[PDB]
Design a protein around this ligand. Structure first.
Ligand SMILES: CCCCCCCCCCCCCCCCCC(=O)OC[C@H](COP(=O)([O-])OCC(O)COP(=O)([O-])OC[C@@H](COC(=O)CCCCCCCCCCCCCCCCC)OC(=O)CCCCCCCCCCCCCCCCC)OC(=O)CCCCCCCCCCCCCCCCC
Ligand SMILES: CCCCCCCC/C=C\CCCCCCCC(=O)OC[C@H](COP(=O)(O)OCCN)OC(=O)CCCCCCC/C=C\CCCCCCCC
Ligand code: HEC
Ligand code: HEM
Ligand code: HEM
Ligand SMILES: Cc1cc(C)c2nc(SCc3c(C)cccc3-n3nnn(C)c3=O)sc2c1
Ligand SMILES: Cc1cc(C)c2nc(SCc3c(C)cccc3-n3nnn(C)c3=O)sc2c1
Lengths: 241, 378, 71, 64, 48
């Protein structure tokens, strides 16, 4: 019975043909990931070394992952050592032990977020309209014990409580932390997470267009030079009278 | 002496590409044969790079494809060259077939019948490769074909539990999908050499339909420079897609790993299989569905004996040209319907356009050519 | 099929000029525009009316899928 | 805080009051008979579409 | 690998039973322990 509502289009600063990502809004978006989610969501494909030269200095990046100690394998005179994280470690998984992570969430596995804007019909415009589109039910819709109303979700019944409201965090450069400033930064981060070659492919696309602009009008001149013999010729028919 | 005419290897190159007599009025619709040969070489070299880092196992198939796009150096450009180069192959192939149909090139009988074989072998190759990344369209694309492939009356269920390794989907399942997909592009190459060997016996057709031995020109330099220029203009368009929109032609739902337990909101194949899918879903049967899918490629082989006109090409036939673009505008309708869900407006439009695809080729075209013969008094 | 063995022809003469004796662009936008306006006027009534039929079916088809829902 | 500013200013447009009209015209009509399956989750969508089209054109100036 | 060579399938499960092994991680537990499953290789004799 109930039906679709599609996200509108926002003017992100990377929606141009040659427009880059803002590398300061990526930096503020990693901190909203590491302190608001990552208590519900995995990021299985991104490591700490993937953030050196995008948003953090190698040192500033090795200062993080000190913050979490992680299990490693068996060693002699030991069985389950623990140790601080290195640079080659992936981001820690939220709900330890798997799947049956549905109990903390009323039987709704929370999805992995490393491909989430690339795997949705609408990209980061969908993950902006859903985090800021939480509202109250209309006149007489059904609701279970632990589910909420959200018009930008297929069956309008989401099993995630609204995770950002206002002043949920403190940014470390003095940016105000309202509801719309956050969720603008975990849309910029999480677009970099899907597509980490975004800025490199747009600058190879400019060094291809400028060089084709030399090579292509000048193979066309070689073509017109040969074919002018045939394009200008004349014919006469002179049969005997 | 002339070493181009007396050396044993250089003789073959000279007779095939340098001193070959060619018509002088060949259009740029005749460019797409060498474009197909460029697209085939590109898919082979790029595919041989991806095969050193891919793993055919249903627990690590999706994860070995994300690894090359993130870890291996230049793996992201080579992967999206391969996915977008396959759309480039299928758009040149549909231009190529529509050319030979409008200008009457099917009268070269041995060249046309090797071509219908080549059309089956590239469609089966591209199906196997889209199973290999093993996301939620590689899954629900594989099962829709192979429960439709259990409706073969006497050997059907024998053939469905052979391709999965014996089973349902496991580690040894995509070793057979991968080995077919490796081998078939190298048979396509051998069939395209035989294809050109039979065309060398007559030379080319031309847009008028009339024979042109009195007006030949050498192939070099006139069509060596015209084919290089068209190939550069094709490498430009392909890189506009790889570097400015690499996900425009795909579907987002294939970035979720395959899960028999979860659910995909729709089932949509690639754009170049969407016309065949619309003919399937218009037949309420599963033996009459796989028959009408195979009869829509095999109807091309009846074009030589359905020809009733006195002239070879459609340049001077104005009523046959209205029917030619009614047929192109009917394959556009079947591509749109194949990507829609199965409800009321898109169910009658889909079956009234499956009837029109067979009514134009088999009935309306041979009758219209006879009316044209009679208005010219033969 | 090589060049001196293709056909038989009598009494026709061909005149041609060298490529280095010629201009590259004698007329480009003073014959290039009215000649493509002749070639477009010849094709349009054979090619366009089938695609005006796909447009009127797309517009009616995506208008009976919207009104099936919400009254 | 910038969102609640923008969302309220654009809630007084000739498409969003025209949608609010039918919404409470039907909001009042569901609650009377208590054996009814009628929702108005439809009616909410016509208003949220009209409103969020105008929020997107104006919101990103006030951020970052 | 010993079924049909020197032992039957019973006499082979019952010999894999004789040493319990160290299985992997699960929820509500740890990497737990369990007897042999007949798909196990011969148990190694030095920690590292
Ligand atoms: C790199 C190179 C690529 C090659 C790698 C493999 C690719 C596959 C391939 O080569 O395909 C070529 C494929 C078969 O390859 P092939 O068998 O290896 O070699 C051709 C042989 O000469 C096959 O003989 P044929 O094609 O010259 O026969 C001519 C014709 C007439 O021949 C006859 O009727 C029999 C007369 C005696 C023939 C025996 C000659 C000596 C042996 O055929 C028949 O009607 C019956 C043939 C006899 C029975 C066939 C089974 C025995 C072979 O040939 C064709 O595709 C022919 C296309 C013509 C279609 C008919 C359309 C016009 C009507
Ligand atoms: C070069 C020819 C161009 C002519 C004029 C150009 C002016 C600009 C308008 C374009 C017109 C146009 O494309 O159509 C007209 C033009 C007239 O050309 P003639 O050969 O001169 O015919 C003479 C009849 N009077 O028609 C053509 O170009 C015919 C094109 C040949 C067929 C097209 C090639 C492929 C087309 C579609 C492929 C889809 C079919 C799929 C088949 C796959 C199997 C399932
Ligand atoms: C403590 C719980 C919890 C937190 C914190 C949380 N989520 Fe969720 N989220 C969920 C659950 C549970 C689901 C599965 C929803 C369902 O199936 O109904 C979900 C699903 C999602 C989805 C997928 C919706 C879809 O269509 O599949 C997105 C996107 C998402 N969350 C974004 C976020 C972002 C961004 C953050 C934080 C910056 C966040 N979530 C924090 C519980 C959480
Ligand atoms: C991988 C597939 C193919 C390759 C590499 C290929 C290659 C070529 C080449 C190089 C030519 C000569 C140049 C030209 O006219 O464009 C040609 C001509 C031709 N091809 Fe193909 N082709 C392929 C598929 C097909 C198919 C699918 C058909 C038809 C069903 C077909 C039928 C023809 C015909 C009839 C000609 C001669 C046309 C003429 O001279 O007017 N080919 N092909
Ligand atoms: C006519 C030639 C070919 C066509 C049309 C073709 C088509 C395809 C397609 C459509 C995919 C799915 C990619 C995606 O959407 O993600 C694919 C994947 C793949 N193909 Fe090909 N292919 C061709 C030749 C080859 C060859 C010759 C090889 C190997 C020697 C090869 C190796 C692979 C591999 C390893 C994948 C792995 C999955 C991936 O990379 O996405 N392909 N192919
Ligand atoms: C840049 C480039 C280089 C090469 C080496 C090349 N080779 C061909 S195939 C030639 C051919 C053969 C062998 C036999 C029969 C007919 C034709 N032929 N005749 N006309 N046309 C358009 C044809 O392709 S295209 C092409 C383009
Ligand atoms: C000759 C021939 C052979 C085959 C085997 C074939 N198959 C199709 S449709 C397959 C499909 C479905 C039904 C659903 C989702 C995805 C895909 N699919 N699989 N590969 N690709 C590129 C896809 O789009 S037409 C066709 C024609």
């Amino acid at each position: 019975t109930d039906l679709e509502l599609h996200a509108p289009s926002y003017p992100w600063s990377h929606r141009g043909l040659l427009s880059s990502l803002d590398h300061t809004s990526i930096r503020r978006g990693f901190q909203v990931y590491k302190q608001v989610c990552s208590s519900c969501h995995s990021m299985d494909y991104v490591a700490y070394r993937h953030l050196v030269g995008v948003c953090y200095t190698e040192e500033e990046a090795k200062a993080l992952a000190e913050e979490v100690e992680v299990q490693d394998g068996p060693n002699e005179d030991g069985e389950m050592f623990m140790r601080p994280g290195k640079l080659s470690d992936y981001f820690p998984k939220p709900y330890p032990n798997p799947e049956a992570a549905r109990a903390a969430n009323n039987g709704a596995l929370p999805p992995d977020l490393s491909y989430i804007v690339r795997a949705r019909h609408g990209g980061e415009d969908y993950v902006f309209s859903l985090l800021t589109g939480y509202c109250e039910p209309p006149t007489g819709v059904s609701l279970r014990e632990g589910l909420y109303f959200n018009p930008y979700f297929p069956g309008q019944a989401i099993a995630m409580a609204p995770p950002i409201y206002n002043e949920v965090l403190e940014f470390d450069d003095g940016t105000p932390a309202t509801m719309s400033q956050v969720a603008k930064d975990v849309c910029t981060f999480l677009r970099w997470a899907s597509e980490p070659e975004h800025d490199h492919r747009k600058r190879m696309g400019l060094k291809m267009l400028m060089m084709m602009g030399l090579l292509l009008p000048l193979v066309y001149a070689m073509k017109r030079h040969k074919w002018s013999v045939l394009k200008s010729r004349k014919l006469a028919y002179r049969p005997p009278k | 002496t002339n070493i181009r005419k007396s050396h044993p290897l250089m003789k073959i190159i000279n007779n095939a590409f340098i001193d070959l007599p060619a018509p002088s009025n060949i259009s740029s619709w005749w460019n797409f044969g060498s474009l197909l040969g460029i697209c085939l070489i590109l898919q082979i070299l790029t595919g041989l790079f991806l095969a050193m880092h891919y793993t055919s196992d249903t627990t690590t198939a999706f994860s070995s494809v994300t690894h090359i796009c993130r870890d291996v150096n230049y793996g992201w450009v080579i992967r999206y060259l391969h996915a977008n180069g396959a759309s480039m192959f299928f758009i040149c192939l549909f231009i190529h077939v529509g050319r030979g149909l409008y200008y009457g090139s099917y009268m070269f009988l041995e060249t046309w019948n090797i071509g219908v074989v080549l059309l089956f072998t590239v469609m089966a190759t591209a199906f196997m490769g889209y199973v290999l990344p093993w996301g939620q369209m590689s899954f629900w694309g594989a099962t829709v074909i192979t429960n439709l492939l259990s409706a073969i009356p006497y050997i059907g269920t024998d053939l469905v539990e052979w391709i999965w390794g014996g089973f349902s989907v496991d580690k040894a399942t995509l070793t057979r999908f991968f080995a077919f997909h490796f081998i078939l592009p190298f048979i396509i190459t051998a069939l395209a050499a035989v294809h050109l060997l039979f065309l060398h016996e007559t030379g080319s057709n031309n847009p008028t339909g009339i024979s042109s031995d009195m007006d030949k020109i050498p192939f070099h330099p006139y069509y060596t420079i015209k084919d290089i220029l068209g190939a550069l203009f094709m490498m430009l368009i392909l890189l506009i897609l790889v570097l400015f929109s690499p996900d425009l032609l795909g579907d987002p739902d294939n970035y979720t790993p395959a899960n028999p337990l979860n659910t995909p909101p729709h089932i949509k194949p690639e754009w170049y299989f969407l016309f065949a899918y619309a003919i399937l879903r218009s037949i309420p049967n599963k033996l009459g569905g796989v028959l009408a899918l195979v009869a829509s490629i095999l109807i091309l082989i009846l074009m030589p004996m359905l020809h009733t006109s006195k002239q070879r090409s459609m340049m001077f036939r104005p009523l046959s040209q209205c029917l030619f673009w009614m047929l192109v505008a009917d394959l556009i309708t079947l591509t749109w319907i194949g990507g829609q869900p199965v409800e009321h407006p898109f169910i009658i439009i889909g079956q009234l356009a499956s009837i029109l695809y067979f009514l134009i080729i088999l009935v309306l075209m041979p009758i219209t050519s006879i009316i044209e013969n009679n208005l010219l008094k033969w | 099929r090589e060049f001196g063995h293709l056909t038989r022809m009598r009494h026709v003469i061909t005149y041609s000029l060298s490529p280095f004796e010629q201009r590259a662009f004698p007329h480009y936008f003073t014959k290039g525009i009215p000649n493509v306006l002749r070639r477009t006027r010849a094709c349009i009534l054979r090619v366009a009316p089938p695609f005006v039929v796909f447009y009127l079916v797309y517009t009616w088809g995506t208008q009976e899928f919207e009104k099936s829902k919400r009254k | 805080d910038p969102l609640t500013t923008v969302r309220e200013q654009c809630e007084q447009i000739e498409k969003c009051i025209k949608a609010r009209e039918r919404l409470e015209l039907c909001d009042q009509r569901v609650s009377s008979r208590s054996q009814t399956e009628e929702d108005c989750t439809e009616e909410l969508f016509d208003f949220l579409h009209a409103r969020d089209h105008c929020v997107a054109h104006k919101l990103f100036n006030s951020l970052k």
